[PDB]
Amino acid sequence: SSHHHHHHSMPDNTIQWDKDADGIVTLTMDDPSGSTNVMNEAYIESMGKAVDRLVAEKDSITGVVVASAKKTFFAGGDVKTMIQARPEDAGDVFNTVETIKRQLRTLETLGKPVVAAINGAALGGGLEIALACHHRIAADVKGSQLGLPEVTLGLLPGGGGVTRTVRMFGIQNAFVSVLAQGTRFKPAKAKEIGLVDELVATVEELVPAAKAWIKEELKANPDGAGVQPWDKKGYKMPGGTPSSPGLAAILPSFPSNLRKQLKGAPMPAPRAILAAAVEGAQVDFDTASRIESRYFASLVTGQVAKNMMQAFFFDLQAINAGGSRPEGIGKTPIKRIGVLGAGMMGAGIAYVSAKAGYEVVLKDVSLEAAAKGKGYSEKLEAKALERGRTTQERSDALLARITPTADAADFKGVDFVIEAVFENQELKHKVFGEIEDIVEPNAILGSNTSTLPITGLATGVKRQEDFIGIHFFSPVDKMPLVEIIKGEKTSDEALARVFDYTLAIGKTPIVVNDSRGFFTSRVIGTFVNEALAMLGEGVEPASIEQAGSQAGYPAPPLQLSDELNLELMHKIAVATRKGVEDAGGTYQPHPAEAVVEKMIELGRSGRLKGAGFYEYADGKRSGLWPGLRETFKSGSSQPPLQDMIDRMLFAEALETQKCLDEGVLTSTADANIGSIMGIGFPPWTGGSAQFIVGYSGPAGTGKAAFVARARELAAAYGDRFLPPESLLS
Amino acid sequence: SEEAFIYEAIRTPRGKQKNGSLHEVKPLSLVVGLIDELRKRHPDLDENLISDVILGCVSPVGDQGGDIARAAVLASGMPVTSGGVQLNRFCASGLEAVNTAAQKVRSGWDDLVLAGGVESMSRVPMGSDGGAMGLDPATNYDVMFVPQSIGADLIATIEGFSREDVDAYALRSQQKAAEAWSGGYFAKSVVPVRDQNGLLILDHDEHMRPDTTKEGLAKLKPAFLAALGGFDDVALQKYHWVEKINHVHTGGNSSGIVDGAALVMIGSAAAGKLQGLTPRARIVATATSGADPVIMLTGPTPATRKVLDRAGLTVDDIDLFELNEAFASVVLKFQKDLNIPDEKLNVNGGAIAMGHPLGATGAMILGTMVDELERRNARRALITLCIGGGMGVATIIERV
Amino acid sequence: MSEEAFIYEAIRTPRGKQKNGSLHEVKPLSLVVGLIDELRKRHPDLDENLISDVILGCVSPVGDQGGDIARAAVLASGMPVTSGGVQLNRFCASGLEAVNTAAQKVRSGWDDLVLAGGVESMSRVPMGSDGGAMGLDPATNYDVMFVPQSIGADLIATIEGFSREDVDAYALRSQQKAAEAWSGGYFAKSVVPVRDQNGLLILDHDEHMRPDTTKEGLAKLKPAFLAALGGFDDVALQKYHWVEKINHVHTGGNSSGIVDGAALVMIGSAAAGKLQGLTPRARIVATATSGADPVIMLTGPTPATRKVLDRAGLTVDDIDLFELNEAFASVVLKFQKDLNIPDEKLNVNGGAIAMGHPLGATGAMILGTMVDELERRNARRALITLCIGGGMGVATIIERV
Ligand SMILES: O=S(=O)(O)c1ccc(Br)cc1
Ligand SMILES: O=S(=O)(O)c1ccc(Br)cc1
Ligand SMILES: O=S(=O)(O)c1ccc(Br)cc1
C-alpha cells in the first residue's frame, strides 16, 4: 500500500526534479555515491518520493521524462546486499521488489505519457525502468547496451522485466531472445526487436526529443496517451495466451526444450523465468507481477545465485581490478608484437593482437604456410563484414597492423614475443635463442605451452627476467582466458606488462606459478581421467556422457577425450611419469591410462584418426563406437547417476585445492575464473573453489558437507577423493 | 461381500478421424443411442433400480463437458434419481468406470449401475482440456514430462523390438479384426449408430484396413506433441544408459483416433433375479498399479500381477488376455514379461485396427471378452490398459 | 460390511474470495499438493505405497484443472507412481462423491488406503468454462427445460413461502455461527494455511466471511447478480405451471460464495490404519444417492437423506448433527422444514453463505467440518448432504469413533 521500503520510524537522494512551463516533469537520475546509476536503497526511496510527488501534483503535470546524468543510463543493483540474502529473508526480498514494481506501476498507469531518455547502457534494473515507460528513445552512442542479464547471475528480471517483455513480445519470443540468456543488444538491434522505439545521434538531443514526443502524443492520440497496450480494453498478447489453441499446442514443448539446451544441468534460473512467464500470462498484469516476485525471491535466497554472483561479479572484478597484477608497477606500451609461429594457435594470437589496435609481426617458416595465419584473420573479417560487425576501414587497418614476414631482421622495434611453433622442449630451446639479441632490451619473450614448465625453457635466454609463459586456448578468437605462467626468473615488471597486454586484447588473465600442467591442463586431466576410469569399471558410456552433461559441463568427457588426441593424453602420461621418476619418486598410474592404451592398441586415437569413443564420418560426430560396450564390459557396474556426476566434479574441485595448497594459484578468484572460462567448469558452481564452500546435497551445505561427501566417495571409489588437510581440522 | 455380475455389454462402432461417419454425431447421442438399445433388449426393466451412470471421459470439455453422464440420464428420459457421474483416468477411464460400478455394488450400497465411456475424438481432440502437467512449466520440468509416443519407442529400443517386430504385430491385429467381423463375433454387441429419423450412419468399425500388407506398413514414416524438440533428450536424461531412441512406431502400428462409446450394465445377483436378467460374467478382481512416468506404458505389467494375486490365480488359469493396443511395442513387452501364449492375446484384434476411443476403450475391450468367453465357452479372461502418466488398471472376469 | 471404511484425516485450505482474492495467484494443483504435504507432516513415517488411489472431485476440469489433476497431484507431490489418480465430476457433490467412492472401494476389499477430496479455483477456472452439453446442444437444453440453480432457489422460496426476510435471517445466522467457530478456534487444526515457494503466507482464513453482517445491510442488496438473461423465469414456470410469479429473494448475501479452495480426506480400512499406526476419527456408516426434479434442480437432498437413513436403519433423532451445503438460503430452509430438523442441529459452524462454495471441494470440506464438530462435542453421528445441479442428491452418515 506504500511506495517506500519502510513505513515506521536516512540515505542519499538520487533523482532530480525538473518541471517546466509546459508541465513536463524531467526525472534525472544522479547517484552521488558512484559514477553509475544502480538499484540500491537510495534509488528505491528516491523514486518513492518522485512517484508520490507525481500523484499529488498530477493536476498540473502533462508528462514525464526519465533521464540520467551519468555516462550510462542505469545498470544493475547492490550486489553486496543481494549475495547475503538468507532463506529467512525471503519476506524482505519479496517486499523490496514489490515496492520497486509498485513505483513503476504507478508511473506506468499515471494517465500521462512517460518517455525514457536512454543516454547510454540500460541493463537489468535499467531496462526494467524504461519498460515501464510508454516511449523509449536511445542514442546510437558508442558503448551503449540494452538487455536483462540477470539470468547470468543466477537471478531473473524481478522489476517487471519478465512481466512486461512476455506481455510485449509474447511468451516464446520474450523468453528465447531476451530472458533465457540475458542477451545484450546495441541500440540499433534493440530498435529492431522492439525494446526501443526511436533513435537519435548524440545524447544532447534526447530530452528535447522526449519532450517533442510528449507534445505530439497528447495532440494526435489524446486518449491512448500514457496507456500501455496491455492496459487497453482489447489487448491481445502476441502469440496468444496459454488459453489460445495455437499456443497451448506447443506450450508443453517449452520445458522439454529447456531441458535440452541446459542438458539437465541444475540451473534453476531459466526454470523460474519460464515458470513466471507462463503463469503470468494467465492472469492480469498485477497478479502476474506478484508471481514474478515470488520466483525472484526463490532465486536470490538460493545457493546457485550466490555461486554465480561470486564468480561473475566479485571474482571477475577483482581480476580486472589488477589483483594478480604486481603491486605498484606501471605500464610500458606494446609497440610491435612479434608472433613467432603461424599455425592454428599462432593465427589467433595475431588476430586478437591486431583487433586491439597493436602492430603485429607474424613470422614463420614458409611464406606460403605463413599466409594461412593471415588468411585465418581474413576468414574472420570477411564473416564479420557480412554480419555487419565491422567496417571495411576497420577491417583493412586491422590486417594492415599484421605484417606477415619471414626475416629475423624485421624486429627492430618489437618489444613483445609470443612463440607458438610446436611442442618439444629441446626444439624450443634452440628456436628461442634467435631473436633475443635482435629485439630491444625491454622485449618480452613469451611461450605458449600446455604442460612443459617454463623455468626449464628459461635457461635458453640471457634475459631470463623477460621469459614468460603466455598460454592461449583454441580457438584464440573466442576463448576468453589467458593463463600467464610465472617462472622463477620472471620479474615483477615483465609479468605486469603481460597482464596489461591481456586486458588490452580483451581477455581474462590469471597468474600461475611454474608447475607441471600448471592449473588449466592439470585440472582438466582429472576430469577426463575420472570418466575413463568409470568406463573401465564397467559403466555404460552413455551414462558417462549423461553424467557429464547433467553436471553442467559444456562437452561430455568421452566426447572431449576424442577432441584432444588420446595419444596426446598418453604422451603427457609419460612426461609426468618421467617427471616423478627423475626426482627419486615412484609414479602411480591413473586407472584411466589402461583405457587409453586399450583404445590406442585398438587403433582408435580420437577425432584426427577418425575413430575414438565415437565414430566420425563426413567430418561430423556420428555415435558411440558400438564395440565399446563389449570391449570394456559396459553394464557390469551400475552406480547411481549422482555418484558419477559427483566423481567428476569432486576430482576437479580437489585438484583445485591441491593447486591452491602448492602455491600454483595465488587467490581463489583466479581458481574460479580459471576453471569456469578455461576448462569449462559448470557456471552454476561459481568456480572449482566456490564449489567447495557452496556445495549442497543430502549431507548439508558448506565445506563440512563437501568433506563428508568427499569421504563418502572415498569409501566407494578410491582414496583420490579423500580431502586435503587444508579442508579439515 | 456381494458379487457383481455383468448383465449387458454393448458398444457403438468406431468411426475414423479423417472424414469419419460419426463426426456429425454429438458424443451425448452416442451414449443415448446405447441406452435406448438396452431398453429395447429389456423393456420390462424397472429403470428406477439403476442408481448411477458412471461414464469415462478423458477430455471432458465442450461437447463432453458438464457431466455428460448426467446429460445422458436426462436426455434419454431415464429416472431423475439415476445419478450420473463422469470420471477421468486417461486410457483406463472406460475400465475404471466398470471397476467402480462393480465396487459400488460390492460395497452393497448400490443395486444396479450402468457404466461405460464415450469419446468423440474427431470433435474433441486429445489434450483439449488443457492440463496441469502440460500447460505449466514448473511441473512439466520437475516430473520430466514426455508423451506416450516417445515412451513406446523407448520400450522398443530397450527390449530390442525392431521396426519389423512391431509392424508384424499390427498386421496380426488387422487380420484378427477382419476375421472376427466376418464370423459375426460382433454382430450382437456392436449397436449401429442411427439418426433422429432411423437412418443408418455407421454399422462397422471403419478404421480397419483389412488389406494391410507387410510391404505397405514398411513404407510408413515414423510419427515421432512429438516432432516438437525436446522429448527425445528428456527421456535419455532419466534413461541415461540408453544412447538413442529407435523410433519404430508409425500410424500403422499405433492405435487409431476414432469416435465411439460403450455401455456395461452391472448389478448384484438380487437385482438380476428381481428384474429377470441373465448374468453373463462375474467381476472376479480388479487392481490399480503403475510404473515410471517417463516410460509410461509399463503400468499394465505390475497391475496384471496384482490382480492375479487377488483372485489367487495364475497366467495359466486365464483363458483369454486382452491388453489395449495403444502401441505395438507395449503389447509385445507385455507378452514377453508374463510369457503370454501367442494364441491367447487380443484374439479378436485390437485398437490398432479398430481404434482407441480413449474414455470408452476400457468398456469396449471388456465387452469384447464377454462376447468371446461365451462364443468359445471358455471360463476366465483378463483385461488391462496402459495409462498416461505411468498408471495401470486390470480386471478379471469369469463366464456365467 | 466385513471391511468398514474409516476416516483418519480430513483437512482443507482456507477459502479465498473471487474478486481481489488471495488465492487467485495460486494454481489449483498447488492447493492439492499443499494438503498432501500437510498429511506428510502429520505422519512422516507413513508408507505411501499403501496409498492405492487418489480421488479428486472437480466440476470444471479444464485448463489449470484439466488433465486428471488428481494424477498431476500424485506426480507433483512426489507420491509413489503406483498411487493412482482419478478426477470425477458430479457437480456440487463431487467432493463427497469422492469420499463415498473411496469408502465403497475400501469396503469392496480391493483398496487398502485411499485419498479423496476435491479442488476448485473458481477465480481461475470460472463455473461453465468446461463447456457443457446444454447450450452446445439446444435440442437437449430445450427438451430438459434447463433452469440455472439461481432461479430454482427463488422458486423454492416462492412455493414454500420463504420471504426475503426469511432467507436473509438464515444468511445472518450462517455469518454469526462462522465467526463464532473461527474465533473460538474450532478450525485451528483443519484449515491448513496456504504458503508460497518461499514459505511466505498467502492466506490462512476464510476471507469471504463478512462477520459484521447486519439485518439492514442484507436488505440493501439486490437479487440475482446467466440468470440475468431472459427466458429462465418462463421456462421454470412452464414446468411448475401452478405458480404465477417467481419471487426473487436470493442475493449475494444469502447465496453461496464463489471461492477458491481444496480439501483432502484419508480413508482406509481398520487393518490398514493399524498397519501404519493411524488412529481412526470417524466411520462411514452409510452413503446414498438419489435425485429430484431437474427444473427446480436444487431439491434432492431430502430423498437422499431419507435413503441414507433407511440404509443405516436410523431416524432423524438418532443423527446428532446435520450438515447441508448452503448453496442458497431457501434450500436449507426447505430441508429443515421437510424432515423437521431442529435449528441447533443444522449447519452449526456456519456454511457456504459465509465461507464459500468451492464446487468440487465442498463435499470434502463440510464432511471434514463434521468430523471436528463431533469430536469437539463428543457427539455420535452426523449427516452430510449436498444439493446438486441437474437434480441429483448425495448423503452420507458418519459416526464418531
Ligand atoms: O532492503 S532494501 O530495500 O534496502 C534493498 C535490498 C537490496 C537491494 Br539490491 C536494494 C535495496
Ligand atoms: O534481506 S536483505 O536485506 O538481505 C535483502 C536482500 C535482497 C533484496 Br532484493 C531485498 C532484501
Ligand atoms: O545488471 S545486471 O542485470 O547484471 C544486475 C546486476 C546486479 C544485480 Br543485484 C541485479 C542486476
Short mmCIF file of C-alpha atoms and ligand atoms in Angstrom, two decimals, chain A residues 38-39 74-80 82 123-125 128 147-153 155 296 309 313, ligand 3:
data_model
loop_
_atom_site.label_atom_id
_atom_site.label_comp_id
_atom_site.label_asym_id
_atom_site.label_seq_id
_atom_site.Cartn_x
_atom_site.Cartn_y
_atom_site.Cartn_z
CA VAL A 38 22.26 1.46 -9.77
CA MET A 39 19.27 0.00 -7.93
CA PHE A 74 21.22 2.61 -15.37
CA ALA A 75 22.91 -0.72 -14.62
CA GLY A 76 22.23 -3.43 -12.07
CA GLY A 77 21.78 -3.41 -8.30
CA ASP A 78 23.58 -3.59 -4.94
CA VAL A 79 25.27 -6.97 -5.32
CA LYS A 80 26.97 -6.65 -1.91
CA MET A 82 21.85 -9.46 -2.54
CA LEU A 123 20.95 -3.08 -18.13
CA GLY A 124 18.98 -5.10 -15.60
CA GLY A 125 17.15 -2.65 -13.37
CA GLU A 128 13.15 -2.57 -16.37
CA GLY A 147 19.25 -6.06 -22.02
CA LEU A 148 18.14 -8.01 -18.96
CA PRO A 149 21.20 -10.07 -17.99
CA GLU A 150 20.02 -11.11 -14.52
CA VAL A 151 19.97 -14.79 -15.51
CA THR A 152 23.78 -14.68 -15.83
CA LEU A 153 23.93 -14.05 -12.06
CA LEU A 155 18.63 -14.35 -10.94
CA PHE A 296 12.57 -13.85 -7.80
CA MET A 309 27.28 -13.59 -8.16
CA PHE A 313 30.71 -10.15 -10.32
O1 LIG D 3 22.97 -5.55 -14.45
S1 LIG D 3 22.52 -6.89 -14.12
O2 LIG D 3 21.23 -7.23 -14.69
O3 LIG D 3 23.54 -7.90 -14.45
C1 LIG D 3 22.32 -6.94 -12.37
C2 LIG D 3 23.45 -6.93 -11.55
C3 LIG D 3 23.29 -6.98 -10.18
C4 LIG D 3 22.03 -7.05 -9.64
BR1 LIG D 3 21.82 -7.13 -7.76
C5 LIG D 3 20.90 -7.05 -10.44
C6 LIG D 3 21.05 -7.00 -11.82
#
